[PDB]
Structure formats: C-alpha cells, structure tokens
Give the backbone structure.
Amino acid sequence: LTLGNTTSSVILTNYMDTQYYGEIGIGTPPQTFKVVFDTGSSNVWVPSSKCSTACVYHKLFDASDSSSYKHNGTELTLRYSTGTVSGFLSQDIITVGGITVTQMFGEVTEMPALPFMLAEFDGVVGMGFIEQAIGRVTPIFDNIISQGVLKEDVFSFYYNRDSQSLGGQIVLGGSDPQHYEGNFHYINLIKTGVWQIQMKGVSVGSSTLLCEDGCLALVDTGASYISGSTSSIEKLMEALGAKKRLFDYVVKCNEGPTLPDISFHLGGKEYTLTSADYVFQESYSSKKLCTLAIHAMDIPPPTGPTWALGATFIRKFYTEFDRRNNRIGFALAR
Ligand SMILES: O[C@@H](CC1c2ccccc2Sc2ccccc21)CN1CCCC1
Ligand SMILES: O[C@@H](CC1c2ccccc2Sc2ccccc21)CN1CCCC1
Ligand SMILES: *[C@@H]1O[C@H](CO)[C@@H](O)[C@H](O)[C@H]1NC(C)=O
C-alpha cells in the first residue's frame, strides 16, 4: 500500500558556486556516492570498481558487495558538454533521501582525468525525460513516479551562495517554502522530453539586445553557469565590456559592481540578475581580473541551439520541475 503523501529532501553541498552535490546509496548494504542531480540529462551513473584516470579520486561501486545487484552489462557511452564517460549497465536498489527504487544505472569504467579529476562528485543522477535517456533506460524520477509515493509529481531545487550553512536542497514531491519568497510563476515546456522553455528576450540594463525574435532556454541544474551560443555570448560580453581569457570571460574587479543588470524574459516576466549574481567578486582591485558566471556552450541539435540557465540563474530563482503539468516554476530564492 503506497499512499501519495510523501515529500523527501536531499541536502546538497555547494562546491565554489559551480558544483552542487548530494548523497545517494546504491546496493544492499548501501554504498554511498556524491552525485549531481542534473535536469539536462536522463541517465544515472557512478564510477565502477572495474575502472582501470579520474577513478582514483572517486568512490567506486563494487557489484560483488551487493546482494540486490542484477547483472546486465550492455555497453553505454554518455556525452556531456564537459566530457564523455563510458561503461556498462547494472541494476540495483538506489536510495535517494529515503525513497528506495530499483534502478538501471551506468557502472563507469572509462572516466578521463580531464575534466573528471575536477569533479568533487562521484557520478550523475539525470533528472531529465526518457526521450533523452541513452539506451532508452528508464530515468530515476520516472521510476519514483511509478511507485506512487510522492505528494505531487514534481521536484524542486534550491542552490545557495557559498560557516555552517546549507549548500542547497532537492525536494522530491514538492517545494520547500522556507527557501523561496512569494509565489511561483510557471512556464510551460515547448514539448515534453526536455526541460526547455521559450525565452522572449535577453536585456542588458535598458536595451533588449539578444533573443529579440525569441529563443530557447534549457533549465539545467547540472550547468554551473548561464550559457548561450558562441555568437550570443560574444555580443553579450561586448555589451558588458568583458574580455575573453582562455576558459573564461573577465572584467577588472573594480568595474564588477558597476556592471549592468541582465534580464531574461520568460513567460509573463523578466528574471533579473544584478552584477552581484554573475560576477565572482573575489577582489575589488583595479589591478585584478574578476570572472563572470556566464560562458558560451554550443548545444547541438535536437536540444540546441539553446541558452542554458544553470546554477547562476537557480541561485537567484528557486526552481520547480512539474512532470504532471509539463511546466517549470520560478520563485525568488530565500
Ligand atoms: O572551478 C572553476 C572551473 C574548473 C573546471 C571544472 C570542470 C571542467 C573545466 C573546468 S576549467 C578549470 C580550469 C582550471 C581550474 C579549474 C577549472 C571555475 N571557477 C569560477 C568560480 C569557481 C572557480
Ligand atoms: O558545469 C560543469 C560540468 C560538471 C557536470 C555536471 C553534470 C554532469 C556532468 C558534468 S561533467 C563535470 C566534470 C568535472 C567538473 C564538473 C562537471 C563544468 N563547468 C565549470 C565551468 C563551466 C564548465
Ligand atoms: C539490459 O537491459 C535492457 C532493458 O533496459 C534489456 O532490454 C536488455 O536485454 C538487457 N541486457 C542483458 C544482457 O540482460
């Protein structure tokens, strides 16, 4: 007997405003892993004990220590913006904030030192739809929905700004009103299968200089930043006075607080980020260079070309992902 009144939460760790990770347990007895909960992907994967470069710094799943494990072994390859992992399929019981689910997941045996040596998390829990799942593997949230335990078929994200403070939180089955102010404003997904909405414009202060004839916005919990196409970012950075370095865009630290507001027109409203929301203000010196929490990412079709609203956006706006209604809700984070 499963009664739909459950609302479970996973505490997240904030690593330098770029990586937000929580704990999941795999197997019997449970083997714990630090995972990023990512709306931009649909597969679950952790490093395998069968891993032969980045594997050395992470926790590895040993199937031989789990009584609940069921072999499969189908080969699997997962491509991310940052890097590609490879392994095989395994099935086991996954515990996520109290909820226990029988899940098919990836046992990663090929984890390159770049970029995975830089990951503070062990694996990824893809919070996207089956349409985007590799090997057509049933996503974890789809499996939790099938159990009929959740209060509502929704999950929400809270990302805090980096004492003994909470780095973030995921709520499965609801939203935590302690982490948002006012009410949610919802935007319907263009289509089911992808956590993507229509964007009606991007404004720099006064003038709406980009996305004038509309564009797409992927609401990506796994993305550290706000990203646009190379073309869109080059124009945006020019309007900000930012300069291209090797991996990032920079401004003189003293100019940082003088930077204009960036607005994203989504559904009925404008979602504004002030300079304090997008500049890593590590100094105020005129002789130092400060990094922006904005970059270029060319997302390939069918999903891209698209903007991605990552942790930079989510820190400002507490986000709710509604599977029942196929919509996303935003509320000012508290
Ligand atoms: O953490 C930083 C990003 C980090 C990184 C992680 C995964 C994949 C690529 C890169 S590029 C790179 C290069 C050299 C050192 C570290 C890094 C971002 N910074 C901005 C705020 C926190 C620091
Ligand atoms: O956004 C970050 C990407 C992040 C990540 C998140 C979800 C799923 C896969 C990966 S791959 C990976 C590997 C190592 C460290 C971090 C990460 C990387 N960014 C840092 C600066 C912008 C790029
Ligand atoms: C692995 O699992 C898939 C279902 O996701 C199934 O179709 C396939 O036959 C399985 N392979 C093996 C070798 O068990």
User: Anything to note?
Assistant: The radius of gyration is 20 Å.
